[PDB]
Design a protein around this ligand. Sequence first.
Ligand SMILES: *[C@@H]1O[C@H](CO)[C@@H](O[C@@H]2O[C@H](CO)[C@@H](O)[C@H](O)[C@H]2NC(C)=O)[C@H](O)[C@H]1NC(C)=O
Ligand SMILES: *[C@@H]1O[C@H](CO)[C@@H](O[C@@H]2O[C@H](CO)[C@@H](O)[C@H](O)[C@H]2NC(C)=O)[C@H](O)[C@H]1NC(C)=O
Ligand SMILES: *[C@@H]1O[C@H](CO)[C@@H](O[C@@H]2O[C@H](CO)[C@@H](O)[C@H](O)[C@H]2NC(C)=O)[C@H](O)[C@H]1NC(C)=O
Ligand SMILES: *[C@@H]1O[C@H](CO)[C@@H](O)[C@H](O)[C@H]1NC(C)=O
Ligand SMILES: *[C@@H]1O[C@H](CO)[C@@H](O)[C@H](O)[C@H]1NC(C)=O
Ligand SMILES: *[C@@H]1O[C@H](CO)[C@@H](O)[C@H](O)[C@H]1NC(C)=O
Ligand SMILES: *[C@@H]1O[C@H](CO)[C@@H](O)[C@H](O)[C@H]1NC(C)=O
Ligand SMILES: *[C@@H]1O[C@H](CO)[C@@H](O)[C@H](O)[C@H]1NC(C)=O
Ligand SMILES: *[C@@H]1O[C@H](CO)[C@@H](O)[C@H](O)[C@H]1NC(C)=O
Ligand SMILES: *[C@@H]1O[C@H](CO)[C@@H](O)[C@H](O)[C@H]1NC(C)=O
Ligand SMILES: *[C@@H]1O[C@H](CO)[C@@H](O)[C@H](O)[C@H]1NC(C)=O
Ligand SMILES: *[C@@H]1O[C@H](CO)[C@@H](O)[C@H](O)[C@H]1NC(C)=O
Ligand SMILES: *[C@@H]1O[C@H](CO)[C@@H](O)[C@H](O)[C@H]1NC(C)=O
Ligand SMILES: *[C@@H]1O[C@H](CO)[C@@H](O)[C@H](O)[C@H]1NC(C)=O
Ligand SMILES: *[C@@H]1O[C@H](CO)[C@@H](O)[C@H](O)[C@H]1NC(C)=O
Lengths: 316, 316, 316, 170, 170, 170
Amino acid sequence: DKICLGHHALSNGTKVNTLTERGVEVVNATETVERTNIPRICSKGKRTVDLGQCGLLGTITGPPQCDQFLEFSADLIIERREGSDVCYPGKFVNEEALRQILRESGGIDKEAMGFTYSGIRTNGTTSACRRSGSSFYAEMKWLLSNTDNAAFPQMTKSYKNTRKSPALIVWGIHHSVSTAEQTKLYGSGNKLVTVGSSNYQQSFVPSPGARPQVNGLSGRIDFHWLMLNPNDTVTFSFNGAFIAPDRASFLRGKSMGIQSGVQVDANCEGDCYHSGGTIISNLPFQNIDSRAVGKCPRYVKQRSLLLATGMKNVPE
Amino acid sequence: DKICLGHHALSNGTKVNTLTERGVEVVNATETVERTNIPRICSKGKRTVDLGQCGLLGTITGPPQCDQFLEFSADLIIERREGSDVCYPGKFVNEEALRQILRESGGIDKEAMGFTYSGIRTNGTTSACRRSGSSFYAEMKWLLSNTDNAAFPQMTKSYKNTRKSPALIVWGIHHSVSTAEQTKLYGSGNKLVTVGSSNYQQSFVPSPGARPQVNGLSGRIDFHWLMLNPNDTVTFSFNGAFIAPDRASFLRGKSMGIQSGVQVDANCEGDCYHSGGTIISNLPFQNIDSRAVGKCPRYVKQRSLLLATGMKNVPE
Amino acid sequence: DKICLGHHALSNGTKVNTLTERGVEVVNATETVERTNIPRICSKGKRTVDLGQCGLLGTITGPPQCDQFLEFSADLIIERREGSDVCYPGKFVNEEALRQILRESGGIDKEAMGFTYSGIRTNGTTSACRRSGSSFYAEMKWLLSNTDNAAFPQMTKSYKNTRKSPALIVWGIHHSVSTAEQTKLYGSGNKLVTVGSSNYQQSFVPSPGARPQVNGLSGRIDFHWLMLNPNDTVTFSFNGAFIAPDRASFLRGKSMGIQSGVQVDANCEGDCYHSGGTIISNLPFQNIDSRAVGKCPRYVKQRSLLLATGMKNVPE
Amino acid sequence: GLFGAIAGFIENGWEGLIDGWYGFRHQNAQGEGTAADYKSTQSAIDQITGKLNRLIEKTNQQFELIDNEFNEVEKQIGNVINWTRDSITEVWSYNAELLVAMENQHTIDLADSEMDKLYERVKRQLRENAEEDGTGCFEIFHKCDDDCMASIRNNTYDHSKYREEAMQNR
Amino acid sequence: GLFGAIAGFIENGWEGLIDGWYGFRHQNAQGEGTAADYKSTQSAIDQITGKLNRLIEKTNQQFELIDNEFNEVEKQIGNVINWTRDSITEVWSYNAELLVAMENQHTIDLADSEMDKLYERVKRQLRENAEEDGTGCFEIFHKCDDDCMASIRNNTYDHSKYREEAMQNR
Amino acid sequence: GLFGAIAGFIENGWEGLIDGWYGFRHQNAQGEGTAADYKSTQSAIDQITGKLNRLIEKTNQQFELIDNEFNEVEKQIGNVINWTRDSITEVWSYNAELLVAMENQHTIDLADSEMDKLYERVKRQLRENAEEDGTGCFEIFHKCDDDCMASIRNNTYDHSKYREEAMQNR
Ligand SMILES: *[C@@H]1O[C@H](CO)[C@@H](O[C@@H]2O[C@H](CO)[C@@H](O)[C@H](O)[C@H]2NC(C)=O)[C@H](O)[C@H]1NC(C)=O
Ligand SMILES: *[C@@H]1O[C@H](CO)[C@@H](O[C@@H]2O[C@H](CO)[C@@H](O)[C@H](O)[C@H]2NC(C)=O)[C@H](O)[C@H]1NC(C)=O
Ligand SMILES: *[C@@H]1O[C@H](CO)[C@@H](O[C@@H]2O[C@H](CO)[C@@H](O)[C@H](O)[C@H]2NC(C)=O)[C@H](O)[C@H]1NC(C)=O
Ligand SMILES: *[C@@H]1O[C@H](CO)[C@@H](O)[C@H](O)[C@H]1NC(C)=O
Ligand SMILES: *[C@@H]1O[C@H](CO)[C@@H](O)[C@H](O)[C@H]1NC(C)=O
Ligand SMILES: *[C@@H]1O[C@H](CO)[C@@H](O)[C@H](O)[C@H]1NC(C)=O
Ligand SMILES: *[C@@H]1O[C@H](CO)[C@@H](O)[C@H](O)[C@H]1NC(C)=O
Ligand SMILES: *[C@@H]1O[C@H](CO)[C@@H](O)[C@H](O)[C@H]1NC(C)=O
Ligand SMILES: *[C@@H]1O[C@H](CO)[C@@H](O)[C@H](O)[C@H]1NC(C)=O
Ligand SMILES: *[C@@H]1O[C@H](CO)[C@@H](O)[C@H](O)[C@H]1NC(C)=O
Ligand SMILES: *[C@@H]1O[C@H](CO)[C@@H](O)[C@H](O)[C@H]1NC(C)=O
Ligand SMILES: *[C@@H]1O[C@H](CO)[C@@H](O)[C@H](O)[C@H]1NC(C)=O
Ligand SMILES: *[C@@H]1O[C@H](CO)[C@@H](O)[C@H](O)[C@H]1NC(C)=O
Ligand SMILES: *[C@@H]1O[C@H](CO)[C@@H](O)[C@H](O)[C@H]1NC(C)=O
Ligand SMILES: *[C@@H]1O[C@H](CO)[C@@H](O)[C@H](O)[C@H]1NC(C)=O
């Protein structure tokens, strides 16, 4: 007698939100916000450099913890909490900018600056940079006056950049414990250092005085840097207080830099990283970490946003 | 004979915009962009501190106008145009960063730094900080040499942070009218001050010379600051020119900071503020002020965006 | 016997994307992403100033290449790669901020500062600023000591801003090749310069030393600036090393600034510019240059996004 | 709208219908009358109110000051801030404009369909006892007294009890 | 589309119909002919053009340079700027892609419905004088000369004047 | 939904229909049976999967660190960064919420229409050999054996071969 049309249904649907309705039940639905983290740095197929105890800025200056990182090559660079940029206590001026450069550098190649010295010492060392006995930053030279209280002569040193990519130049400035220690090291009087390239002008007079004993030492070393362009020349006028660059750094190519506290894993591949690990997902959004980096789903504040993949559920 | 289906209508609808049409008339509509301002700061239920003539940075140093704000507590902090951070003319280095910290501080608690001094004066005052006769910043000490033209000895002062939250440390630097006034105050010669904590290195040599008579005075005081971490120590080497912190500041919790020129009102509650008052609304957008702060509707450029809440109007 | 309803169609449609489908063919479609560039700066109807060899910051100081730009007026300002801000080698502190101010200035009007000098020279010149023989920056004065090695006295100079808009004040600092050249110019000893306005405090001690021969010269001139408010006064204390402003700059109104390497064209009108030219379009999006400026279509990464303007194509 | 009822095959709306959104207007031997359909009306109201519930809210996300109205921040950082704010303003102004236009398109169509759904409901109730006018009316062959009309309105109308007499009038 | 007419119960479109978007193709004793419906065609064109009017514009909002192509800004601020610009680019690329796909979905469905609305209009005009074919055609019982066909097209066709003869052919 | 079939004139869904999304349930002298319609089912599945293909992806756009979790950046720049990130988070949270709600509205309606399109297909196949029940059923005058029912399902049913006997039962 009769023929009837109908549609499938379940006893119990999945609730989703629409333009007009909160919590309408549908036959099937799926998640659009990723919540699953992988608690490893998934680095399958990538040249990875885990800096460990080496601080990223220490790869340019070379404290003992960074000896195996002086010319690293990488697609992915991992900074660790235990990293330290320094052996002799000190810090870099414009430090975060420099970390950002080095994170995407592809790693670094090193080249001799070509400085020679006459009328001064060049081999200043210390207890805090330990290589079986006292030492110093592997890429740097601590310039002193020939002997205690001797006049450190006014000096003029050049380096031209004969390569086709910008050279990263780093130099330091020493801050002795005393005002009397500045005289012993480089002779008494106000010392001046200046730096000049096509688009750079800056000068630094030292500032002695006591500081807290870091690494058992109360002195500090300032660290400074600029990018010297191809065919550009850079000049260093100095009367003392000055830590001379031995080598220049050139950037290799391209990389991605992350900070993290979890283990490397070459068994999984991922392109979205955060400190707690790797977000592997095809979903358009994620609610794990708003500071995730790489190629990531967009961060949203919602934990879940279900997308209907079936008709509305209208049970018996 | 017949039965007819129909729908309601009005003689005159409300015009709205659609995907295909500008100005289609509908039965009813409602506004989505808020234009109604309340010309008061609606602070019902909130611990509110209206700084009035006290400048927000003056709560850390304590000029006379800020005497009642040295240890305030707040959910909401209001800066006024008439506010002044200084009594003796001067300004802070990194000032806006510090205001941003203090705006969300929840207010401040003060603690003795614990400095003692031997071989120098400690009670420098002036006409511009009036507390029935001359005075000075309530939280600071103006350090001088024992007598006119006397040698201000090289000094080394420490403060450890024994609490579990970062301590805000503030100190000043004086800039006398003359080069001769610098010698009278702290003795002749170039004076050096330096500061060193785990992640901080900076030095300041003074700079005397004449300036415009502000508050009738042509001298200036520099103000400087850093956040000293828990269990970290901070050292001050100084030969003079230096304004010593007596107390350190600790931040209480959380607050919201606003700038405004209208009255406080404890009769209304709001969470979105701008200089002209409070935006109280459930609407998703507002066209009052793009720099409104708190928890606000999103600012849009349109004055009005009507949302249809009825069918299309098709009159007789 | 029968009447049939139908719709038009073509043998071959235009593929577009929908919510459910990639590459569905429709009867007609149109592009929403602009890809057509015009390789000129389309400036019909606009007061245009093409700086050419004049650097934008050079309009404030006046090297010979900028002689015809000392008081320009403009709606549109064009910077060129061949532009130079300097004749005597040097650079500005806070340079990009100043370029941003000048780009939207509407151009500049110049006014005498009103400085007189007693006990010093005022007419220092050089080989690198050529106006048929040696010269100097047209808006500046190179202050020297009366004669070689003579004491440059400590000096105190004021300028009040009696106009209703902020005055841009520029001054320089010289960095001679030698430490001996600093003594010849302004007498031996450490020279100090300071600057003080209602909301400004800064000081600059010079820094001699050798630099690369730019324009055949190894000296450098620092350039410095602040915005002096209406009815505010600014003071310059100086012992030497100092390049004095002759005139102050006032901003005229409003303009738009661009950098470009293509020709001006008064035959076409446009409001969206980039270095390669002008984007003339009514389309909502563009895929030419993400750094385009003016009033532009939004930059998107896609080269093309076709919008259906006809029904789906369902051919025989 | 899409369903071609409102501003479609129904010529126009009724200004006298103050009782609901949709309704019936009959004409028989006892005269004309008009009554509002609750179900259809309520279904449209509920969908529209659900839109409002969704849209009428701001977020719990707090934003603080990053610049200063009494003491201008440094120019470079200030210009970056202004550029960023203006960019964000441009996104929200677009979002707001597009949201409202899309919603309004859907609201109008949604009301259109509810009208159509009521129309088709009644057509189905009447079976072969009536025929479509084309203007939004059903001409009824057999005799519907005011009782009859109320049975249609209240979904109780039995087509088989008037079928033959209506069929005979083919 | 949603209304199941275009690429639905109508097998396909006519390539010979260059006169409008929609139309009638008849077949009688006098032969076959085809004619475009203005009203339906115009209603779809007007809705589509209204979309374009809305979409084809940029804003009056000016943006200025915050970085420098000839003289690189400081690296830190430069990276913040680039990050911000790239973030904004990502929002607009999404907005643009979603806008176009949503509009295109609606445009296709909108055209589908206009086809359906024309189909239902005619069905209602013909009353009991015709029956649905199922392919988008109405088989007519009584004899429609070219005059008759034009009356249907122009909305003047009176069903009662051919009813009995069409009914008798049931 | 908009088309008034699912959660509309069809009272409810069938929990026994595990074969497809849509289907026929018949009742004749040989008893009751139920079978899934492939075409309608597949058309809805294909549209829904096409949505997923569009939506299930992230972009190839890389973002790098602009701040530092181990060594806090300067406060001013840090606050600008946080403000910018939070502003962007607010845009995407909105985009995500609106996208899903809009898609879900369309998905539900899309399924509703496919149900309706199947319903109208069959109505058209049956011609004057059947009449609408109103609950989603077609009462058939003439005698449909299980063969007959399968002809309707498979689109082969010829209305003219049972017409008179069905018509005679008017
Ligand atoms: C950033 O934009 C603000 C406005 O949003 C600018 O401040 C305004 O400047 C105009 C013109 O000088 C004044 O009329 C207003 O009083 C100012 N309003 C506010 C709220 O400050 C500000 O100048 C811009 N910043 C920069 C660096 O150009
Ligand atoms: C910010 O991005 C711009 C491009 O949008 C970078 O500038 C480009 O750098 C590449 C590689 O060095 C050059 O090939 C181009 O000539 C540059 N284009 C422009 C328009 O300047 C810039 O380096 C980025 N900024 C930072 C700090 O990394
Ligand atoms: C910017 O926001 C970040 C978080 O996104 C702030 O850093 C967090 O600070 C809280 C409270 O001190 C700590 O509990 C977390 O450990 C921090 N998280 C991270 C990832 O750093 C940061 O302080 C904010 N920046 C500024 C200048 O306020
Ligand atoms: C439905 O029924 C119960 C909750 O009452 C639960 O066990 C089951 O998982 C539910 N299924 C779904 C799809 O919600
Ligand atoms: C329901 O959706 C999920 C996605 O979460 C999918 O994998 C699965 O195949 C679907 N299940 C059914 C029975 O359709
Ligand atoms: C450092 O170098 C000088 C060279 O002048 C040499 O006399 C001295 O012994 C060296 N000291 C050490 C510890 O190598
Ligand atoms: C640098 O100079 C060399 C010649 O020594 C030349 O080959 C090269 O092209 C120059 N590079 C640039 C960027 O001008
Ligand atoms: C309609 O009629 C007049 C304008 O002609 C005006 O008084 C009335 O407010 C209007 N109402 C609406 C809802 O637009
Ligand atoms: C029309 O909309 C407003 C919102 O602006 C609402 O408050 C009011 O109840 C509505 N009026 C009617 C008659 O529905
Ligand atoms: C300041 O302190 C010194 C303590 O050495 C004292 O001699 C002097 O009288 C004090 N002056 C004032 C005004 O209190
Ligand atoms: C600071 O040192 C004290 C011991 O004096 C210890 O209790 C506390 O945990 C330390 N805090 C941190 C952050 O290391
Ligand atoms: C359709 O046919 C051919 C490609 O096969 C080509 O010549 C013609 O331009 C095409 N037209 C469109 C509108 O795609
Ligand atoms: C098709 O679209 C274009 C826009 O690209 C328009 O200019 C043209 O008039 C349209 N052509 C036809 C035949 O409708
Ligand atoms: C510069 O000015 C001084 C004025 O004291 C004058 O003696 C000298 O000749 C001038 N030199 C030149 C080259 O104009
Ligand atoms: C500046 O002072 C003059 C009086 O010399 C006065 O006319 C003017 O209003 C003042 N401007 C401001 C901004 O206070």
